[PDB]
Amino acid sequence: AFYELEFGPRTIMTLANFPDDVLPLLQMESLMTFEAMAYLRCDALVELGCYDGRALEIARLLNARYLGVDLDQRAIETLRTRIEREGMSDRADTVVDDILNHTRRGASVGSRALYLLPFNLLGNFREPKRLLDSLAERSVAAVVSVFGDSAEATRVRQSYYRRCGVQGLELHTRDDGTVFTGSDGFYSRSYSRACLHALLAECGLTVVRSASNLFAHCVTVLPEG
Amino acid sequence: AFYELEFGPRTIMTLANFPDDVLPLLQMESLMTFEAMAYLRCDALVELGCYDGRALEIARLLNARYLGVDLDQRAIETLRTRIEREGMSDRADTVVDDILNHTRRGASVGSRALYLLPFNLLGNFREPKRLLDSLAERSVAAVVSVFGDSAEATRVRQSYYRRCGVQGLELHTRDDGTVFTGSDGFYSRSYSRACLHALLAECGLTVVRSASNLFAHCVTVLPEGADQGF
Ligand SMILES: Nc1ncnc2c1ncn2[C@@H]1O[C@H](CSCC[C@H](N)C(=O)O)[C@@H](O)[C@H]1O
Ligand SMILES: Nc1ncnc2c1ncn2[C@@H]1O[C@H](CSCC[C@H](N)C(=O)O)[C@@H](O)[C@H]1O
């Protein structure tokens, strides 16, 4: 709903609106994704909500296939021009579509694809089970990066979302995370290590690696079967 | 000189001042450092120009030692608080000193230390051979990240330095790279694949892996005569 707005994806994904304490989250998920690709021998990387290809360099340096899924057409156009200039036109592609449409009805990318859900993508879903169930039913390994329920995490997010200029930004503290809502249909929540592992268990996704810094949690998961 | 100014490191290293085209450079530099440490069995990471510990997460995920060197007091204070809260007080450490001072007269970190020169740090040295010569003693390996001489790179750099707000920003075109100067005492040059490999060869640093995207070049080097054991 929110990311169907003209400058909805831009305002959220532009580095200009990023506090300095966001970078640790982005670095942790990058290294987790990179190593998960190598160990599980994933010849493809499917970044759900790629924007301008935030995980293209991972797929590039492993000489793996890439697919960037996002609703922002302007950001996907940057990624298309980037793929051409880098010379990955043969082993890189982009689609302008809802990530749930791709995961449900889309075609396979390579033989073994890793599905990245970067920068608290799972937090922007009210019923995230629908997305995690489509991954589980796809029989593909996945990486899930979310914000933490620490005091420092919530502070960085509050700053981060205010720079983006989310109309009617309201903080809602819960036991298993902190939820930020906006008048423009903006929804985003953080996760506790326990809640995230519990949610993934409910959707039949086994945790093999689990990294957690001050700001973020990142987990590599395998579908049961 | 420029980074001894109170808000010299702050303006250059604040994410808000980064174009979106810069993140690929940082990502490539991170993945190569992460993999170099693993392959070369480095038990310690020494990030020169760490700011707020920009490579701390690499040392964290490898269970390796960490030392952040930077002139910014406020940025090192953020790193100390982060090291404390993430429970790395026994593994991680920080110093507020000139990287050349540390590299010449500083104590070693662990048995096998990899020295990271991140985000075109080597570019901000008029006489970079001074910095490269000092690495031989205290390190078994090093990662050198640096901007490219490409048209797209110079465009991103011009955009990047303008957002940082460098006083009297001037572009000086060369065959080797592109030099950006400021009236603050700011200096920052890019390198060509050839000129970088040539400079590292002159200082006795052998290139092992060499990655290059549209904007940047990143190389893993070994000092000639250093230990290559486990
Ligand atoms: N249903 C959907 N289909 C496609 N892209 C989506 C999407 N939902 C989100 N995205 C994309 O996901 C990317 C990152 S979402 C970032 C979330 C934010 N950091 C937070 O804390 O909540 C954006 O570029 C956005 O366009
Ligand atoms: N001589 C020195 N001693 C200590 N830190 C230094 C230093 N020179 C630079 N630094 C630190 O190195 C960090 C990165 S410098 C980044 C260079 C910039 N990206 C460019 O393109 O030119 C800064 O935080 C700065 O404080």
Residue numbers in the entry:
A (entry chain A): 16 to 240
B (entry chain B): 16 to 245
Give excerpts from the publication.
AZE synthases catalyse the intramolecular 4-exo-tet cyclisation of S-adenosylmethionine (SAM), yielding a highly strained heterocycle. More recently, AZE synthases have been discovered in bacteria, namely AzeJ and VioH, which are involved in the biosynthesis of azetidomonamides and vioprolides, respectively. Interestingly, they show sequence similarity to the class I methyltransferases (MT1). Each subunit adopts a classic Rossmann fold, consisting of a 7-stranded β-sheet (β3↑, β2↑, β1↑, β4↑, β5↑, β10↓, β9↑) surrounded by helices α4-6, α8-9 and α11, a topology that is typical for MT1 enzymes.
The surrogate is located at the C-terminal ends of β1 and β2, with the binding pocket enclosed by three short helices α1-3, three β-sheets β6-8 and helix α10. The SAH-adenine moiety is coordinated by a GxxxG motif at β1, while MT1s usually use a conserved GxGxG motif for nucleobase binding. The SAH ribose is hydrogen-bonded to Asp85 at the end of β2, and the homocysteine (HCY) moiety of SAH adopts a kinked conformation. Moreover, the X-ray structure illustrates that HCY α-amine is bound to AzeJ in its neutral form. However, while DDMT-N1-MT accommodates a linear conformation of SAH, this arrangement is blocked in AzeJ by specific protein interactions involving the Cγ-carbon of HCY and the C5’-methylene group of the ribose moiety. HCY-COO- is hydrogen-bonded to Tyr176, Asn139 and Ser203, while HCY-NH2 coordinates with the carbonyl oxygen of Phe134 and the hydroxyl group of Tyr175. Moreover, Phe134 engages a π interaction with HCY-NH2, which would increase the nucleophilicity of the latter. The kinked conformation directs the nucleophilic nitrogen towards the Cγ-carbon of HCY (2.9 Å) and induces the cyclisation reaction. DFT cluster models of the active site were constructed based on the AzeJ:SAH crystal structure.
